[PDB]
Amino acid sequence: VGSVAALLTVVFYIAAVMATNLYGATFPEWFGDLSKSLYTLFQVMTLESWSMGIVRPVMNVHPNAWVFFIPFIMLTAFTVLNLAIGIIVDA
Amino acid sequence: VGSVAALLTVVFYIAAVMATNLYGATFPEWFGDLSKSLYTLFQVMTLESWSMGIVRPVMNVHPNAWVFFIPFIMLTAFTVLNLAIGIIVDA
Amino acid sequence: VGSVAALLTVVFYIAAVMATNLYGATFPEWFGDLSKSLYTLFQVMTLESWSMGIVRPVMNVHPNAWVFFIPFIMLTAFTVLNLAIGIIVDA
Amino acid sequence: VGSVAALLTVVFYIAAVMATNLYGATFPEWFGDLSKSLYTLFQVMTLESWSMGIVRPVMNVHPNAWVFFIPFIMLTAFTVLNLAIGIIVDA
Ligand code: NA
């Protein structure tokens, strides 16, 4: 259960470093510092305005931005679901 | 578990072909190419701006668009939930 | 499992009759016919733009609209969660 | 199961008192009265427009508002998930 929570933190930092690099210069309010990034990725992770509010405007500059965001969503939603059941089994 | 993941991909391509056909000419940024469709159907699948963002503007041209989108949502949300538990049982 | 699915349909029709009555005259695009209602309640049920997009504008006319929507959300989210596990137990 | 539901109500009132205090004077429509707060915290709890709708505009005045909202989200989403499974185990 704790191994999954650690794995998520590692994945979350790698993607926030990557996003900062790719979309920072073009989208500064969303991916400027690594701090702005980790916040935006959590927002995308909870699904809140992920497409109409972040991905669609980003794709208007980077047409393949979906190759980054869609897998990140599928991964973090699977990891969170796997982490959720870990607590369920332990009880 | 893998049989459900394959079934979802087949259903996702059939609906992405159908939407392209029905709402393509009228809503090109959302359903123009099959690719544009697959992206918008995933957005609808995650529930992100499905109604206010997509369905409501579409229904202003196609008043029965809800006959397509509502079942797609109920189906994909059931399939994902069934796929989620498949991994849980196997653990 | 089927008893819960029937219970939800009964609850969904009662609330769509009630909403049509309360907020129809003031909010016609959202609660005009019972048809417009059943669509909006499903949108609220999936959580899509429930507060900023429906409840907050409604409360600007009906300050207690939250007494209707919040319980409907808590009820339908519990019923769907109970219906979800029903399929899980049967497998 | 009932102990978790009581714990959530206590946590929801403490955060609703805190938010009222911190973001009340600056954001009155969202955190003016404790009542206005309890409604906005539930909206954030369901994830509806949490970031683009509330947190991002709040952070434009209080740059560290994320220290309050992100943990509240992680806590209430864990508590609700734990409360959900409590009913599942008892069945
Ligand atoms: Na959502």
Side-chain angles (χ1 to χ4, degrees):
Chain A
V1 194
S3 305
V4 174
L7 182 122
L8 186 91
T9 310
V10 173
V11 155
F12 219 86
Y13 269 81
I14 291 161
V17 156
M18 278 189 60
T20 295
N21 176 237
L22 305 152
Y23 324 113
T26 35
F27 299 87
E29 297 286 271
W30 299 335
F31 315 92
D33 12 274
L34 162 82
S35 354
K36 301 190 207 157
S37 270
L38 285 149
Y39 171 80
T40 294
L41 290 175
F42 180 83
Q43 174 197 320
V44 161
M45 199 228 85
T46 65
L47 300 162
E48 205 295 284
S49 295
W50 81 260
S51 169
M52 310 289 272
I54 308 283
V55 184
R56 286 193 187 269
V58 174
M59 286 204 300
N60 272 303
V61 175
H62 316 275
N64 292 319
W66 64 269
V67 184
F68 182 88
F69 297 99
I70 296 163
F72 170 83
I73 286 151
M74 299 188 293
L75 175 70
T76 61
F78 170 78
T79 318
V80 158
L81 198 132
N82 190 46
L83 173 64
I85 59 93
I87 315 148
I88 298 157
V89 172
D90 283 42
Chain B
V1 193
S3 305
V4 174
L7 182 123
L8 185 91
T9 311
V10 173
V11 155
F12 219 86
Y13 269 80
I14 291 161
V17 156
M18 280 188 190
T20 284
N21 177 238
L22 305 152
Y23 324 113
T26 35
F27 299 87
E29 298 284 93
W30 303 336
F31 315 94
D33 347 304
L34 154 86
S35 88
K36 278 194 233 144
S37 286
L38 279 152
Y39 172 81
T40 317
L41 287 176
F42 180 83
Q43 175 197 321
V44 161
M45 199 229 85
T46 65
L47 300 162
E48 204 295 283
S49 307
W50 80 260
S51 180
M52 309 293 271
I54 307 301
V55 184
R56 287 191 186 271
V58 174
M59 286 204 298
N60 272 303
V61 175
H62 315 275
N64 292 318
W66 64 269
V67 183
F68 182 88
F69 297 99
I70 296 163
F72 170 82
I73 286 151
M74 299 188 294
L75 175 69
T76 61
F78 170 78
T79 318
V80 158
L81 198 135
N82 189 46
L83 170 269
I85 282 79
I87 315 148
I88 298 157
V89 172
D90 282 43
Chain C
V1 194
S3 305
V4 174
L7 182 122
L8 186 91
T9 310
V10 173
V11 155
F12 219 86
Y13 269 81
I14 291 161
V17 156
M18 278 189 60
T20 295
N21 176 237
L22 305 152
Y23 324 113
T26 35
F27 299 87
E29 297 286 271
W30 299 335
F31 315 92
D33 12 274
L34 162 82
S35 354
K36 301 190 207 157
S37 270
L38 285 149
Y39 171 80
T40 294
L41 290 175
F42 180 83
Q43 174 197 320
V44 161
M45 199 228 85
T46 65
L47 300 162
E48 205 295 284
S49 295
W50 81 260
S51 169
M52 310 289 272
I54 308 283
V55 184
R56 286 193 187 269
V58 174
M59 286 204 300
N60 272 303
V61 175
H62 316 275
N64 292 319
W66 64 269
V67 184
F68 182 88
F69 297 99
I70 296 163
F72 170 83
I73 286 151
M74 299 188 293
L75 175 70
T76 61
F78 170 78
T79 318
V80 158
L81 198 132
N82 190 46
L83 173 64
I85 59 93
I87 315 148
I88 298 157
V89 172
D90 283 42
Chain D
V1 193
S3 305
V4 174
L7 182 123
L8 185 91
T9 311
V10 173
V11 155
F12 219 86
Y13 269 80
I14 291 161
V17 156
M18 280 188 190
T20 284
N21 177 238
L22 305 152
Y23 324 113
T26 35
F27 299 87
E29 298 284 93
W30 303 336
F31 315 94
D33 347 304
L34 154 86
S35 88
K36 278 194 233 144
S37 286
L38 279 152
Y39 172 81
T40 317
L41 287 176
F42 180 83
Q43 175 197 321
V44 161
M45 199 229 85
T46 65
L47 300 162
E48 204 295 283
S49 307
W50 80 260
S51 180
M52 309 293 271
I54 307 301
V55 184
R56 287 191 186 271
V58 174
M59 286 204 298
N60 272 303
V61 175
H62 315 275
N64 292 318
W66 64 269
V67 183
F68 182 88
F69 297 99
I70 296 163
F72 170 82
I73 286 151
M74 299 188 294
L75 175 69
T76 61
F78 170 78
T79 318
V80 158
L81 198 135
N82 189 46
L83 170 269
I85 282 79
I87 315 148
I88 298 157
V89 172
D90 282 43

